[PDB]
Amino acid sequence: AYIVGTFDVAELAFLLFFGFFIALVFYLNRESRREGYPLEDEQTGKIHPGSLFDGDKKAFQLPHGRGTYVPENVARDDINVPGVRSFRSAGAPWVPTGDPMKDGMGPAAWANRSKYPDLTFDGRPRIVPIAQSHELIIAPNDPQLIGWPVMAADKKMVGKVSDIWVDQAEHMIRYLEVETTTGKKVLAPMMVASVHGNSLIDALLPIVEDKPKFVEIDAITAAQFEDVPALETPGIITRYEEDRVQAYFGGGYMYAMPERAEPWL
Amino acid sequence: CSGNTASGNIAAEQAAQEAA
């Protein structure tokens, strides 16, 4: 069973796989370095040289004649952020100078996405109001959601639901259009919306219950609904606008009220 | 962890249980 001395076939196979796995780990690290690299200094923003084991840049052939992506060429974020360090150290956090939700700091930060909408495989806009979709309807036994009241994080009724935006590719609700008290229509992600009065257990429970059917959005308060980013073109939302709206709502879990940023103690 | 010592538990297992 021995090849030479104490060397055997099983040991040779194990050592070969160990070397292969080291090489695979190096390759996986190279693949993981394609976004956000090279690193930069925390204060001065000086860019680090780059890995000795890096290869060529990766180019993605985009559909719909949108060209090439090249994630290594994505523009680096501006070094000047709207904030000031809590203490002068490389590891200190940044305290936002103004409104973090408006300026895009921390949980409210957004990325510079493409300024055109996502498209279906045939070139139609992917995310559209349910009326503009191709015969897409809400499930008859599911909540209609149209005209339902909307509750904010401060338990105030910001307004009602006036429209539903669906993904034409994935067949999923993506955004709910909310008309507020002032009459402004804003988009709210469906992933921050809790639908009440449609519990599976409650349906299983043999009860006659007049539970209030409404939509609760606890990310942001009723006033903040008046500062949701708007759309450049009606019926169309771009990747950048999607990121803007999602960041604005997601940052509310920290910034809607000051207490949301404080420790439990 | 109990309020006994390991030596006490071992002695109880040996004498009070395994020896009588």
């Binding site: 069973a1 104490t6 055997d8 076939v9 099983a10 040991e11 196979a13 194990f14 796989f17 796995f21 695979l24 996986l28 690290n29 693949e31 993981s32 394609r34 976004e35 956000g36 993605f60 985009l62 992506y69 994630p71 994505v74 930060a109 957004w110 990325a111 996405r113 495989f121 349910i130 979709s133 015969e135 897409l136 309807i137 809400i138 499930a139 008859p140 036994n141 599911d142 909540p143 959601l145 669906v166 067949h171 999923m172 609700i173 992600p189 469906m190 992933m191 921050v192 919306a193 809790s194 639908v195 449609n198 606890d218 990747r239 999607e242 990121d243 999602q246 960041a247 709502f249 997601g250 | -």
Partner: protein, 320 residues
């Protein structure tokens, strides 16, 4: 109060989507479609349509033949009694030919011939299913990652069923077709060859199976936690980096000091899953053919413990 992205609250229904057109010469999809409301709670409610080309027809026919052979042998083993069938189902088994036949292809039907026939038809079905996944990927212009991942599992399957028995010249080394019988085969295989824990490739395959469970838990949790920012739309995040990709990278960078990309994480997952069965097949193939006692082999390589390292008598005594 807070949506947790576990179940879809409101489902969108419409006409069934029949799929993007094929770029090659395909016969045409069989437009048998359905809708399951409860599957739409987790994922997509649409069932179908299906594609049934030459490869699908061959795979279905040969797998039906193999399954019919195994089931009819189960019925014969039960004496054609439905009650005995139900009572002994877990213990029913189509067993390989005994050691006196070696690896001969000519065994009497009741002594192992049906076993060989079922293995042949099952192998044909599995290979045609792999060819079908390859052709389905080719027809859409997609990559061949799924065919290679399936090839790894097929490699383990073929090592278990054909390649290792062929190398040893013994049909009796193969896995029987049965619920409890193939578990018994697993246990006996570990027992005769020392202890399969000390097979380094079995340990590697366990490492990769554990790591795949870890990776899916982490990746699914990260994606669902990023649903507020469109994390599950991974194709667009890979080709146009959004705040979901940035947050996903930064979470794990702040947790463990390093991170992947939205594409690199799927490479990690694919490699862990593939390496599980690759190392498993390698370890099984060398067992008996190369190494007959894995505990002795571990002793020679200074990683086999003794009683003065750890004595498991107490653990056995507790469990009685």
């Amino acid at each position: 109060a807070t949506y947790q992205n576990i179940f879809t609250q409101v489902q969108v229904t419409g006409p069934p989507e029949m799929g993007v057109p094929h770029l090659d010469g395909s016969e045409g999809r069989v437009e048998l479609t359905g809708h399951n409301y409860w599957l739409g709670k987790i994922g997509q409610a649409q069932i179908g349509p299906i594609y049934l080309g030459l490869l699908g027809t061959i795979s279905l026919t040969f797998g039906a033949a193999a399954i019919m052979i195994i089931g009819l042998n189960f019925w014969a083993q039960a004496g054609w009694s439905p009650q005995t069938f139900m009572r002994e189902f877990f213990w029913l088994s189509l067993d390989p030919p005994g050691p006196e036949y070696g690896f001969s292809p000519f065994v009497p039907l009741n002594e192992g011939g049906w076993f060989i026939m079922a293995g042949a038809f099952l192998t044909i079905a599995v290979l045609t299913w792999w060819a079908r996944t390859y052709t389905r990927a080719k027809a859409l212009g997609m990559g061949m990652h799924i065919p290679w991942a399936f090839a790894s599992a097929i490699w383990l399957f073929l090592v278990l069923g054909f390649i290792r028995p062929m190398l040893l010249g013994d049909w009796s080394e193969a896995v029987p077709y049965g619920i409890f019988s193939h578990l018994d085969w697993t246990n006996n295989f570990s027992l005769r060859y020392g202890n399969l824990f000390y097979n380094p490739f079995h340990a590697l395959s366990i490492v990769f199976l554990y790591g795949s469970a870890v990776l899916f838990a982490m990746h699914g949790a990260t994606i669902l936690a990023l649903g507020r920012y469109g994390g599950e739309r991974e194709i667009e995040q890979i080709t146009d980096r959004g705040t979901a990709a940035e947050r996903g990278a930064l979470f794990w960078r702040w947790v463990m000091g390093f991170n992947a990309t939205f594409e690199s994480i799927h490479r990690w997952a694919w490699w862990f899953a593939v390496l599980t069965t690759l190392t498993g097949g390698i370890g099984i193939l060398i067992t008996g053919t190369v190494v007959d006692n894995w505990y002795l082999w571990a002793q020679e390589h200074y990683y086999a413990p003794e009683t003065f390292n750890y004595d498991p008598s107490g653990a056995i005594a507790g469990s009685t």
